[PDB]
Tab-separated table of C-alpha atoms in Angstrom:
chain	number	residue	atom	x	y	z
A	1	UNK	CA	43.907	6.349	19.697
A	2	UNK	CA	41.427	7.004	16.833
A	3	UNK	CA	37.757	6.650	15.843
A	4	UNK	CA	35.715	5.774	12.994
A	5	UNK	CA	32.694	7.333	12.242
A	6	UNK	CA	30.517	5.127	10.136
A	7	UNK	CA	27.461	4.885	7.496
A	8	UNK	CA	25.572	3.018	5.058
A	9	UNK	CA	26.638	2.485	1.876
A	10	UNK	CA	25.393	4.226	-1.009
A	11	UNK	CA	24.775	0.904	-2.981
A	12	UNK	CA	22.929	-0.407	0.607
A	13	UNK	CA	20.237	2.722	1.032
A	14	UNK	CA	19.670	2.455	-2.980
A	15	UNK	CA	18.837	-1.462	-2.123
A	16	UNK	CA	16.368	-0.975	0.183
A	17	UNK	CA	14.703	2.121	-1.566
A	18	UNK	CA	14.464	-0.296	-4.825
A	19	UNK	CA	13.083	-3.188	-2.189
A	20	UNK	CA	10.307	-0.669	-1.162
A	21	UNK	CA	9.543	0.590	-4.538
A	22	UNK	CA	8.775	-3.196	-4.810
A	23	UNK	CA	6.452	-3.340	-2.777
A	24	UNK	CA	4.482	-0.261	-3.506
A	25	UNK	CA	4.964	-1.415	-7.480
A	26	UNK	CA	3.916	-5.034	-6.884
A	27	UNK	CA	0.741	-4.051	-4.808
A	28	UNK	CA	-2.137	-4.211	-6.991
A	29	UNK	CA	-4.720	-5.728	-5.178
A	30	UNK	CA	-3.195	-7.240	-2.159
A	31	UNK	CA	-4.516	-7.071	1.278
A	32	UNK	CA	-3.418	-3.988	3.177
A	33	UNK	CA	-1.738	-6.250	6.079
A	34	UNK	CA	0.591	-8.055	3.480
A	35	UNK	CA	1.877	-4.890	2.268
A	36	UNK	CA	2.693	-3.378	6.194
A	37	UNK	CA	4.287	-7.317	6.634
A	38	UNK	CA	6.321	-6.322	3.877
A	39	UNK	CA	7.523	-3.096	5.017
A	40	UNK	CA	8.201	-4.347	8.618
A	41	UNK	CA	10.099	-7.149	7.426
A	42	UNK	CA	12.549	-4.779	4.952
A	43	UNK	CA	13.035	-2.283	7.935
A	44	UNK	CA	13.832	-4.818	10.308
A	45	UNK	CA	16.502	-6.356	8.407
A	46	UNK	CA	17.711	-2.836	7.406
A	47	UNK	CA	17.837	-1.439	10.727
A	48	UNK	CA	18.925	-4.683	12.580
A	49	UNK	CA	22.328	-5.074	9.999
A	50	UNK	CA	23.235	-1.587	9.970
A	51	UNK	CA	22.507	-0.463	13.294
A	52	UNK	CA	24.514	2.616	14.400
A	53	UNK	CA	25.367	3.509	10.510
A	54	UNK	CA	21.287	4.189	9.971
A	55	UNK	CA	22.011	6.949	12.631
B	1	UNK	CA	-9.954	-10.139	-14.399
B	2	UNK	CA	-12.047	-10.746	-10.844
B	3	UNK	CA	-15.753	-10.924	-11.017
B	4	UNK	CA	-17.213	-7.480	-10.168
B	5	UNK	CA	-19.331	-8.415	-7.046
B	6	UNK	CA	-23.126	-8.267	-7.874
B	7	UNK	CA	-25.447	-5.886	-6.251
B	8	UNK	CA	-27.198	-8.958	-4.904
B	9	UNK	CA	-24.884	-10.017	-3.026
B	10	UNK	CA	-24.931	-6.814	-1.148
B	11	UNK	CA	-28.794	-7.107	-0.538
B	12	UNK	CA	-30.581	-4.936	1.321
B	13	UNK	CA	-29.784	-2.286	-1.458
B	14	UNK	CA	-33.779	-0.427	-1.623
B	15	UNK	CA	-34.398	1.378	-4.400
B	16	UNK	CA	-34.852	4.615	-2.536
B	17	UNK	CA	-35.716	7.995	-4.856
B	18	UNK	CA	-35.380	10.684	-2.642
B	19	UNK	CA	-32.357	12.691	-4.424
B	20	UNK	CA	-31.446	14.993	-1.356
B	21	UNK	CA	-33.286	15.805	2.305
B	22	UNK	CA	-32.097	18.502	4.556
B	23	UNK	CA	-29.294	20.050	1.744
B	24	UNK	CA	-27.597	16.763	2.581
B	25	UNK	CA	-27.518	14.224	-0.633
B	26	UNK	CA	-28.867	11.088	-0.195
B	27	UNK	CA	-26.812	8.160	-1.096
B	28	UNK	CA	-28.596	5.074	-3.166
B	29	UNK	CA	-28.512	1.719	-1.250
B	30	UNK	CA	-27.904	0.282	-4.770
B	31	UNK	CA	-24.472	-0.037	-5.478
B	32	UNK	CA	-24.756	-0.142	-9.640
B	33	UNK	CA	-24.139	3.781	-9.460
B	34	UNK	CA	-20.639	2.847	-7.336
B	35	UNK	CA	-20.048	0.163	-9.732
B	36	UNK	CA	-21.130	1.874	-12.540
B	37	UNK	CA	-18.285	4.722	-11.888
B	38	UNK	CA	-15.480	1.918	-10.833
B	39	UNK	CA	-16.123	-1.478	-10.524
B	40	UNK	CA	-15.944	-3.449	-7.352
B	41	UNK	CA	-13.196	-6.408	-7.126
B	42	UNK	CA	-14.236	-10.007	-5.868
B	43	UNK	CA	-13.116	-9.598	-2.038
B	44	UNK	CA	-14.544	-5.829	-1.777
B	45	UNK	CA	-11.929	-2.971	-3.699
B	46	UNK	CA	-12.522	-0.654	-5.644
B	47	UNK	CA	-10.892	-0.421	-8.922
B	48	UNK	CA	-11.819	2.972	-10.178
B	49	UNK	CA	-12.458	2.990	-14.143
B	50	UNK	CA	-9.585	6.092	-15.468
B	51	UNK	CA	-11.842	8.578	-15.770
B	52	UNK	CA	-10.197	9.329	-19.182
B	53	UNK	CA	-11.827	13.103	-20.636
């Protein structure tokens, strides 16, 4: 009987853009696997939450 | 700030003088030229002094 096409919010994409500006911001002089760890674990729990809406 | 690493600790860093062979440069095994132009950091970066002109 209907449908509903969904997406992330606009609040939710800002988040995570801010949490990898973090990371590139708070680098400095930090190993270059700690920084990867970082990015894996943001995508993860970005693309694990919001799984279809990242599509 | 973390201690520039010494040239020493390096070693093996010959004070060769040949400037070039075969149009290729040659590199000095001494780092003070690299460190000189940015230091090194304590666990092997290199913070580049802002080459400010």
């Amino acid at each position: 009987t209907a449908q509903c096409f969904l997406r992330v919010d606009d609040e939710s994409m800002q988040r995570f853009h801010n949490r990898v500006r973090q990371i590139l911001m708070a680098s400095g002089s930090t190993t270059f696997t700690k920084i990867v760890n970082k990015w894996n674990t943001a995508l993860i729990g970005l693309m694990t939450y919001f799984r279809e809406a990242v599509v | 700030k973390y201690d520039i690493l010494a040239s020493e600790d390096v070693e093996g860093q010959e004070a060769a003088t040949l400037p070039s062979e075969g149009g290729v440069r040659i590199t000095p095994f001494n780092l003070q030229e690299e460190m000189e132009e940015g230091h090194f950091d304590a666990d092997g970066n290199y913070f580049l002094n802002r080459d400010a002109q």
